[PDB]
Design an enzyme around this catalytic site. Structure first.
Site, mmCIF file in Angstrom:
data_model
loop_
_atom_site.group_PDB
_atom_site.id
_atom_site.type_symbol
_atom_site.label_atom_id
_atom_site.label_comp_id
_atom_site.label_asym_id
_atom_site.label_seq_id
_atom_site.Cartn_x
_atom_site.Cartn_y
_atom_site.Cartn_z
ATOM 1 N N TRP A 117 0.862 -1.214 0.000
ATOM 2 C CA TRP A 117 0.000 0.000 0.000
ATOM 3 C C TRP A 117 0.886 1.248 0.000
ATOM 4 O O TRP A 117 0.590 2.177 -0.757
ATOM 5 C CB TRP A 117 -0.988 0.104 1.172
ATOM 6 C CG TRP A 117 -1.728 1.407 1.071
ATOM 7 C CD1 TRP A 117 -1.486 2.567 1.748
ATOM 8 C CD2 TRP A 117 -2.733 1.731 0.096
ATOM 9 N NE1 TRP A 117 -2.304 3.572 1.296
ATOM 10 C CE2 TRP A 117 -3.067 3.090 0.269
ATOM 11 C CE3 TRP A 117 -3.373 1.001 -0.912
ATOM 12 C CZ2 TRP A 117 -4.047 3.721 -0.504
ATOM 13 C CZ3 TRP A 117 -4.316 1.626 -1.693
ATOM 14 C CH2 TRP A 117 -4.650 2.968 -1.489
ATOM 15 N N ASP A 167 7.037 5.858 -8.173
ATOM 16 C CA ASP A 167 8.274 5.959 -8.981
ATOM 17 C C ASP A 167 9.444 5.298 -8.241
ATOM 18 O O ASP A 167 9.246 4.782 -7.101
ATOM 19 C CB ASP A 167 8.503 7.417 -9.399
ATOM 20 C CG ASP A 167 8.869 8.406 -8.299
ATOM 21 O OD1 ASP A 167 9.155 7.975 -7.183
ATOM 22 O OD2 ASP A 167 8.850 9.607 -8.601
ATOM 23 N N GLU A 170 9.805 6.387 -4.702
ATOM 24 C CA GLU A 170 8.736 6.100 -3.722
ATOM 25 C C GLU A 170 7.846 7.344 -3.609
ATOM 26 O O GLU A 170 7.397 7.637 -2.528
ATOM 27 C CB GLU A 170 9.377 5.635 -2.406
ATOM 28 C CG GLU A 170 8.509 4.683 -1.596
ATOM 29 C CD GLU A 170 9.128 4.199 -0.286
ATOM 30 O OE1 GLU A 170 10.045 3.322 -0.335
ATOM 31 O OE2 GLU A 170 8.669 4.668 0.794
ATOM 32 N N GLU A 327 25.265 7.464 -1.435
ATOM 33 C CA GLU A 327 24.038 7.587 -2.236
ATOM 34 C C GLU A 327 24.121 8.899 -2.989
ATOM 35 O O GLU A 327 23.945 8.922 -4.232
ATOM 36 C CB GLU A 327 22.874 7.524 -1.257
ATOM 37 C CG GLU A 327 21.533 7.916 -1.847
ATOM 38 C CD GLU A 327 20.486 7.885 -0.756
ATOM 39 O OE1 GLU A 327 20.287 8.959 -0.148
ATOM 40 O OE2 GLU A 327 19.942 6.759 -0.468
#
Ligand SMILES: [N+]
Length: 372
Positions: A117, A167, A170, A327
């Site tokens: 969900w 996407d 998120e 990242e």
């Protein structure tokens, strides 16, 4: 090209990229996203894992890549009943909720890491098909080793490719993201053009659905000659070059590919550091190593070696003490006021991010700079 100063640095970063990925590979085969980041630790993504696996496959560690494909394959075979149940629900006309769909986060033992969900995504299944086919091709392997898991992923994608979902980042569950459609396209074209899979009952269907994805992106995913972040949008996203290489909505020489590289570079690339999207407030919206690597890869494929080298050097300059790639880095921030609350809540930015290292190995390989 490179003086031996640069070649030396780039070679050592490649060797470290290999070591980071393989040392943190779970015993079961899964590649984690980031072993030390609070929010991601203990979980595997097919998106991160598939690019990580392609890096490792190009580098030549057939054992590591294979164990990751074995892990994904087994996780998907265990979802044969769930996927059959979803398809049968569609066949009765009862469109299943996002909450019943296949997950985004996996535990290392292949359970849902999260409730779909909140993070429903389909791109990862498409990336894995692309990854495993490309690996088997590169190393002359028998896809029958992973076929029952491929069958689960294909059945799932042929039913749910056109469904809105979050996407890669998120966000925006209500939209259809061109890099999600791209990832599914790359996977379907990979299995549909694979001679070892010519007798699969879904063989011809994969190419017909890939053509339906390209129709939808032509109708609603192209503005002013460039791809857009989601159908009906004007704006770009840093993931879009993935829709050229390696997912192949268009090839490198296509005018839409050129216009998309240029639009991403102009709108989101600052001094070789590529941002995700204009509104990004995650750690203030920093510069993502994997997106610089993706744009670099695409410039390499289009014959812009210089452009490609500039992005590889940018990435290499973000390596830390140990040669770990984060990242993202904050040299330019889209929304600097938002950074402090993220560091406060979740800690310093994920480092290493294995996907950062996987994309490093791919761009290095595209430029012929893996150690010999
Ligand atoms: N390439």
């Amino acid at each position: 090209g490179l003086d031996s100063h640069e070649l030396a640095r780039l070679h050592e970063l490649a060797r470290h990229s290999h070591a980071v990925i393989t040392r943190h590979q779970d015993a079961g085969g899964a590649y984690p996203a980031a072993p030390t980041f609070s929010a991601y630790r203990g979980y595997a993504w097919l998106r991160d894992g598939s690019f990580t696996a392609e890096g490792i496959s190009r580098y030549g560690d057939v054992a590591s890549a294979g164990r990751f494909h074995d892990w994904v394959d087994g996780v998907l075979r265990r979802r044969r009943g769930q996927v059959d149940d979803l398809l049968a629900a569609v066949d009765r006309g009862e469109v299943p909720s996002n909450e019943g769909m296949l997950p985004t986060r996996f535990t290392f033992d292949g359970n849902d890491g999260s409730d779909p969900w909140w993070d429903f995504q389909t791109d990862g299944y498409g990336m894995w098909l692309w990854s495993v086919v490309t690996h088997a091709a590169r190393h002359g392997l028998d896809l029958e080793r992973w076929r029952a898991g491929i069958d689960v992923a294909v059945d799932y994608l042929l039913a749910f490719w056109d469904r809105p979902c979050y996407d890669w980042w998120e966000e925006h569950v209500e939209h259809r993201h061109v890099s999600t459609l791209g990832a599914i396209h790359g996977g379907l074209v990979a299995v549909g053009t694979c001679a070892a899979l010519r007798s699969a009952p879904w063989s011809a269907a994969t190419l017909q659905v890939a053509a339906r994805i390209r129709s939808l992106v032509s109708a609603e995913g192209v503005v002013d000659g460039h791809l857009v972040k989601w159908l009906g949008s004007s704006a770009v996203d840093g993931s879009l070059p993935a829709c050229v290489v390696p997912f192949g909505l268009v090839p490198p020489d296509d005018d839409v590919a050129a216009m998309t590289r240029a639009a991403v570079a102009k709108d989101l690339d600052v001094d070789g550091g590529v941002h995700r999207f204009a509104a990004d407030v995650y750690y203030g919206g920093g510069q993502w190593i994997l997106l610089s690597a993706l744009l670099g890869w695409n410039l390499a494929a289009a014959g812009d070696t210089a452009g490609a080298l500039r992005h590889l050097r940018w990435i290499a300059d973000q390596a830390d003490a140990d040669g770990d790639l984060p990242e993202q880095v904050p040299h330019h921030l889209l929304h600097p006021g938002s950074r402090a609350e993220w560091v406060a809540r979740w800690g310093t930015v994920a480092t290493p991010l294995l996907w950062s290292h996987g994309m490093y190995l791919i761009l290095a390989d595209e430029l012929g700079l893996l150690p010999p």
